[PDB]
């Protein structure tokens, strides 16, 4: 098994040891906070880590379906 990532990778694929069960979407920004709206740092989850004052952290519950909008000429 495994999950997707986004972080310091261009992209990569890992999940955490058997405890986590799904993959998540940490919405925030870069330290550069570039003109692309929201950075999303995908990875391993057991529950959906969402906050309220900034961190949207939604999920996907099945294989590969983790990500957001990205792969478009924009």
């Amino acid at each position: 098994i495994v999950c997707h990532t986004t972080a310091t990778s261009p992209i990569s694929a890992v999940t955490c040891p058997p405890g986590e069960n799904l993959c998540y979407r940490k919405m925030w920004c870069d330290a550069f906070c570039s003109s692309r709206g929201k950075v999303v740092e995908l990875g391993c989850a057991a529950t959906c880590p969402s906050k309220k004052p900034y961190e949207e952290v939604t999920c996907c519950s099945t294989d590969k379906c983790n990500p957001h909008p990205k792969q478009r000429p924009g």
């Binding site: 261009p10 870069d30 709206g37 929201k38 950075v39 999303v40 740092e41 957001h68 924009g74």
Partner: peptide, 14 residues
């Protein structure tokens, strides 16, 4: 170089 919500490539994202 980033995985924002507008691109995935380190050319379009940043």
């Amino acid at each position: 170089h980033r995985y924002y919500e507008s691109s995935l490539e380190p050319w379009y994202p940043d």
